[PDB]
């Protein structure tokens, strides 16, 4: 869904605490007005991707204290009230697999991970207690045994198959939910899409620091080494080779991050469509909410992304 | 240059930094100016700048039984707008 | 219905005349293209390490063996300004391409037909849509269907009459406390449970939560011929 918000400074990165370097940077125009306007609009857009996906409904629904859903066990996706962090058993496994002074700052996100988990728990209590009615008006109380009688009719199956085989469907649902808990506790390569976002944002910042030790055709890389050796009619030439060599290193980082922000924007618009068509209703599109005949879906939280659990036929 | 905000009785240490110039309240409203880490800011009530935690919406638990249903009886016709460049 | 539709169009005229920030998505495109052209002009007054920014000044004060150095600092500084302006405009042209393909999809599904996708052509059950013109954009008017008033009832999955289970064809079973009726899911219309609104299949042994009632047969006044 989202990326890591960051912001770079032009004064401390180009000029390492030098007032003689800042006088030559003013002759280059307004290069750093554009570099700070570009990274600001990215960090605003990363807070907008979490609003169109998670904040689909604004009324917080709650689970009733007694569990009677016709034999279905939702104890793996409902949040645990005993833990201080309101997460489920699957959300605790997803948060354990995904793992300076030169003007580099990391701004914190607006929506906290605790507040994201309240958006996911409010939608899990809507598709169970109401189904599809809380996304197109007011919430209407429908029992869970009567919800699948309508969802089976959408794929061309009569209501005699569900009601005469209520024990067979409920046993196959609980065995398929618990199979993901045994799968996510063993293999860690299932979250490779969320790990590539962190690794690409880490190599883009490690390259920006290692380019400060380059000479770019000058005598040395330290700005204090040139001012304490050279006369200012000659020290201006060696400094000007370092300003141009470090300005092109900053323009590559902003340009490469503006294409990654457009790639993560298309993945947030796709995830916002699946939160409304697969979760808030039943979709007739093939290979959109899973392979086969789609019945219902359950959203889950994840670091810098979402995790869907489609139920098919 | 300016150092006129360090008088005191106005600091509020958050996760992004301490907000000097706004007092802390215990209420929770729908905020308009985002600050960071759930904290927001607004200019409401002799007016000042308040700081609070962002609310996620109203609380509404629905009834649920094994033999209960809710059938609508009326309807409203609504017309909305949408702007796309 | 016709009185509720004519009052909804009149609320848009009062909302567009009073609120000035109703078209913020269209004014952001004009303001972003205005700041990009203003930055390209103001960078012509920079020196980039030369004597002066005016090309007519360095060409008149120095020799062509001497003025070749000062012109080179002005060409390289101004060539990176055009390379930056084209690169940022080529990314904004890709964002406006995805918004144009989204408006072409809603022109065919929401306007030219009726879509059953949830929250695509508006909030609620979509009925129709009307397009409107706008500077550098489109404005849609989605007419939807939202239920308002609710009422609690008592439901049941099926009924057993004489050893056979009766399932409904359309709708669900309701009860006002004493009798049982058949109504739809989106509107309340009580009907009599006859053999034309039921579906006999199996017995009433395996259905969990079944109740007992009677199913009226319309062949009983037929025998009085």
Numbering used by the authors:
A (entry chain C): 729 to 827, 854 to 1067
B (entry chain B): 632 to 676, 689 to 728
C (entry chain B): 923 to 1147
What do the study authors state?
The spike (S) protein of SARS-CoV-2 is a glycoprotein that forms trimers protruding from the virion surface and mediates viral entry into cells. The S trimer uses its receptor-binding domain (RBD) to bind with the host-cell receptor ACE2, followed by a substantial structural rearrangement to fuse the viral membrane with the host-cell membrane. The Delta variant harbors multiple mutations in S protein, including two substitutions (L452R and T478K) in the RBD, the D614G substitution, a cluster of mutations in the N-terminal domain (NTD), and two more substitutions near the furin cleavage site and in the heptad repeat 1 (HR1). Here we present cryo-EM structures revealing two conformational states of Delta spike and S/ACE2 complex in four states.
To visualize the impact of the substitutions on the spike conformation, we prepared a prefusion-stabilized trimeric S protein of SARS-CoV-2 Delta variant and determined two cryo-EM structures of the Delta variant S trimer. The two cryo-EM maps, including a one RBD-up open conformation (termed Delta S-open) and a transition state (termed Delta S-transition), were obtained at 3.1- and 3.4-Å-resolution, respectively. The population distribution of the Delta S-open and S-transition is about 75.3% and 24.7%, respectively, displaying a considerable population distribution shift to the open state than that of our Kappa and Beta S structures (both around 50–50% open-transition ratio). There is no linoleic acid (termed LA) in the Delta S-open and S-transition maps, as in our recent Kappa and Beta S structures, obtained in the same construction and purification condition. Besides, the NTDs clockwise rotated up to 7.0° relative to the G614 S-open, which is accompanied by noticeable outward tilts of NTD, loop, and helix of HR1, collectively leading to a less compact S-open conformation for Delta. Moreover, in Delta S-open, all three fusion peptides (FP, residues 828 to 853) are disordered, and the 630 loop (residues 620 to 640) in the RBD-up protomer 1 is disordered while those in the RBD-down protomer 2/3 are partially disordered. In contrast to this, the 630 loop in the RBD-down protomer 3 of G614 S-open remains structured. Thus, the more disordered 630 loop in all the three Delta S protomers could reduce constrains on RBDs, resulting in higher propensity for RBD-up state of the Delta spike and improved virus fitness. Moreover, the Delta S-open structure displayed a further untwisted/open conformation with more distorted 630 loops compared with the G614 S-open, which could reduce constrains on RBDs, resulting in higher propensity for RBD-up state of the Delta spike. Compared to the recent study on the full-length membrane embedded Delta spike, our S-open appears more comparable to their S-open-2 state, and our Delta S-transition is more untwisted/open (up to 6.5°) with the RBD-1 tilted upwards slightly than that of their Delta S-closed state.
